[PDB]
């Protein structure tokens, strides 16, 4: 099978930028290679055809260019709509192969994250669990930390954070922290803080409240 | 490594 | 329109087989071929098949002893099946066409079965509010959300307001339990003033276990 080397593995840019993407094939393929996006949560969608050509209802902005192993997907102004994965396609021997993708990320000033802290719901206090959820919204970059502490004492261990993927309109990241206790646990403490650090931020910000 | 989640590299 | 929609999620257990089935419409069976392509963390994309027109199959070659592609041409459906799975099978399964009869560049593609390959139970979730209060607002802004939790196997999807509210919304992907359960939150941000007046809702559907929640998330 031919093997396809998209190279690098992410290209991080500024909007307006020109970007290239690389692919590099086994062996020579003429120009039977077909380059592809992938949006976050989408499926693959065909940006160019057999090395070059163009296809119906893709931004001018796209082009490719190339011939036998070196291959290249321009774009000549990057917007933040052009945030996801990009993969090539080689169809000049049996089987169709794909190269492994290359990453475009987004750069933008710096954004300070907007801090939210939830207690938890009656509803599951029920159910025997508590889960204190620290949302972090619309900051850039992605670095953060989050610090849980209870009546003060520092937890470490049993809350899990998620990242959102880049906004593709403003290319921020957000972020969830959750704090999962015991009814129990949770019965037994009264101060709930969520302490954050991020580039934006001249002091750390915490949110917290009182069980009550 | 591509993520079944989110349908993307990570 | 062409359009390729490929039936659900779900689970299924190791060594059992797979089985999706690809609609199509806005074109006929007997005029293109229909190609079956995979997506996993190991290998990323691959192609698995294809049905010809004239019912003629190609299978990659690590593939042709457990793998078989069937059609209704009156129906329109394309059946994929494959069997002895095992948990590197774990991937996004799609259907794909080309733009002419017997290429292989992939203009249209199905929105993709997420199947997993685990030994587990299917496993519905609970759905929790995240409710809004002086602790989630900010210049006349409040944010809400809907916890999302315990389910076995992903995805869920959750959207808001029967898909009327779309902006400021950011589903958080699911992060895997030492219970070996899923879990996720989803959050939007509104105006503060509109929450004695708009309802706000998480449609929350969990097609593996057929489980759909809608939670009404209130100021506490």
């Known amino acids: 099978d031919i093997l396809l080397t998209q190279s690098p593995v992410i290209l991080s840019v500024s909007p307006g930028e020109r970007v290239s993407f690389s692919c590099r094939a086994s062996?020579?393929?003429?120009?039977?290679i077909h380059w592809y996006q992938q949006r976050t949560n989408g499926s693959p969608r065909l940006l160019i055809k057999?090395?070059?050509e163009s296809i119906s209802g893709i931004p001018s902005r796209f082009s490719g260019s190339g011939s036998g192993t070196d291959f290249t997907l321009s774009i000549n102004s990057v917007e933040s709509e052009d945030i996801a994965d990009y993969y090539c396609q080689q169809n000049n021997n049996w089987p169709t192969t794909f190269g492994a993708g290359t990453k475009l990320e987004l750069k933008r000033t710096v954004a300070a994250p907007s801090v939210f802290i939830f207690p938890p719901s009656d509803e599951q206090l029920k159910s025997g669990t508590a889960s204190v959820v620290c949302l972090l919204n619309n900051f850039y970059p992605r670095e953060a930390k989050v610090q849980w502490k209870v009546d003060n004492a520092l937890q470490s261990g049993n809350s899990q954070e998620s990242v959102t993927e880049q906004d593709s309109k403003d290319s921020t990241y957000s972020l969830s922290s959750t704090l999962t206790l015991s009814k129990a646990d949770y019965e037994k403490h009264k101060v709930y803080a969520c302490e954050v650090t991020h580039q934006g931020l001249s002091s750390p910000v915490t949110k917290s409240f009182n069980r009550g | 490594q591509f993520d079944l989640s989110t349908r993307r590299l990570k | 329109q062409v359009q390729l929609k490929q039936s659900g999620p779900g689970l299924v257990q190791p060594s059992q087989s797979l089985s999706i089935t690809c609609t199509v419409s806005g074109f006929s069976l007997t005029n293109y071929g229909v190609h079956w392509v995979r997506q996993s963390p190991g290998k990323g994309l691959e192609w698995l098949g294809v049905?010809?027109?004239?019912?003629?199959?190609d299978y990659n070659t690590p593939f042709t002893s457990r793998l078989s592609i069937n059609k209704d041409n009156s129906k329109s459906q394309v059946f994929f099946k494959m069997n002895s799975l095992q948990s590197n099978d774990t991937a996004i399964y799609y259907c794909?066409?080309?733009?002419?009869?017997?290429?292989?560049?992939?203009?249209?593609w199905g929105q993709g079965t997420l199947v997993t390959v685990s030994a587990a139970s299917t496993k519905g979730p609970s759905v929790f509010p995240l409710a809004p209060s002086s602790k989630s607002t900010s210049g006349g802004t409040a944010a809400l959300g809907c916890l999302v939790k315990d389910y076995f196997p992903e995805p869920v999807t959750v959207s808001w307001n029967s898909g009327a509210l779309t902006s400021g919304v950011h589903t958080f992907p699911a992060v895997l339990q030492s219970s070996g359960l899923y879990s996720l939150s989803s959050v939007v941000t509104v105006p503060s003033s509109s929450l004695g007046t708009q309802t706000y809702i998480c449609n929350v559907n969990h097609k593996p276990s057929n489980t759909k929640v809608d939670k009404r998330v209130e100021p506490k």
């Open positions: 062996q020579s393929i003429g120009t039977n």
């Open positions: 057999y090395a070059s």
């Open positions: 049905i010809w027109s004239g019912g003629n199959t």
């Open positions: 794909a066409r080309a733009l002419t009869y017997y290429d292989y560049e992939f203009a249209y």
